[PDB]
Amino acid sequence: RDNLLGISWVDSSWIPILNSGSVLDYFSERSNPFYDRTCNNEVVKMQRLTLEHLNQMVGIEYILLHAQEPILFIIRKQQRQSPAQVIPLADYYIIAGVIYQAPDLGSVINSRVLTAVHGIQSAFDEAMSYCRYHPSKGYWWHFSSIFQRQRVDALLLDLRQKFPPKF
Amino acid sequence: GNRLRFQLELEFVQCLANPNYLNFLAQRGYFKDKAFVNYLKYLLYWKDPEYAKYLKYPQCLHMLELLQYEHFRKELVNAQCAKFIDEQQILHWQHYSRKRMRLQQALAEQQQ
Amino acid sequence: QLQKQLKEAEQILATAVYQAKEKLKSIEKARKGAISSEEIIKYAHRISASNAVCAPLTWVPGDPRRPYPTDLEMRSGLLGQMNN
Amino acid sequence: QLNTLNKVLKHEKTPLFRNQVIIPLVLSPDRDEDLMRQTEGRVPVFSHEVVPDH
Amino acid sequence: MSGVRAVRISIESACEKQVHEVGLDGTETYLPPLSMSQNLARLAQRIDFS
């Protein structure tokens, strides 16, 4: 209950017996952090029959939004003021029988920027301690040719021509 | 009691044969503690036959040995690691069985 | 020529005795190996009673039968249940 | 420069970002040569692991 | 028949061929060449020089 975005809930038995008809039931298994007893689908189950009753009694109605037959089954949480009036609250998507909450385009980006820049800041602090700059010297970071080589290179090319390389 | 110790240790060693649980423990940082390596070293008593007699899932023992190399625990924090190890495990299993069966059947049918 | 032939013979001897040493190593493992057969049969039945030793007849890429204790078996498994 | 620019962009009369919700339509284990090109080599063949991971 | 008597039966390890690498879509790989005569030079490669 700390962070609904950071919770995942699953159950193996319901996994093989999963179909477009049963997705709402899987969300409804109860003891599932994302869904709640307050939702009216639960009230409908407590009563009898599920038909156009979600358009009659209008309120919290979890409804399937988009479905791919094997695994992908997206669910949407709506709050209805009246028939033909829908207000979307949140979206919970089920991938491979694993339910997650759809991250906000912005909460995700905020957390993402925070982790990257925290890493950059740790690296910077460590590098600053590594440095040992002084008024004398460029910056101690603690924490040639004798020019007789042209004749040597001439001799090298001479022995190259004389003794050819053999792969 | 010692009975509960035995049962919990058996369950834990049989559970260690799961790459998902291994990646779980590696990501959660349980391997970095010097207590878990000593616990693993103590867990080597399962190699005895009297203790191996109670192991239903034997695939764990070999895996346990790898955990002692001290380079297996530094890696495996990645999910691709669990991916690849479970891939190779299930591949060895299913391919060995079904490939022996299919090779025998196909050779018997072709030679006739 | 004699030296070359001798060297070839030496190599042959080496490989042969290396294979003999491998056989000796097997024999040393085998000596400690001898055990009750009934016990072997019982252990084979234990490891083979489930889908662990042999892949199932109809086991394609998509099965709850896993080479490990799944996750529902873990959820009721003594391990974390008693740690809780 | 980059961080200041990003924060500045996020806070200049831009749409409310907590409103929108990211939802995946289709996942196919098929090889894709276009997502590999588009994301510059990482994240190829939109599989099942990649949506809980990202 | 009844009351089977278990005797000291010794069995040798069944290591005739090993599957070093297992590829996808079948295709078994028997990398292990089971050699030593060349393994001495292979280990000599590991030996240092510097």
Binding site: Q68, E69, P70, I71, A96, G97 | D86, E87, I90, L91, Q94 | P61, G62, D63, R66 | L27, S28, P29, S47, H48 | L24, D25
Partner: peptide
């Protein structure tokens, strides 16, 4: 189609 793949999809 596309059941979760323990071995890789063929």
């Amino acid at each position: 189609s596309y059941s979760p793949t323990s071995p890789s999809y063929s």
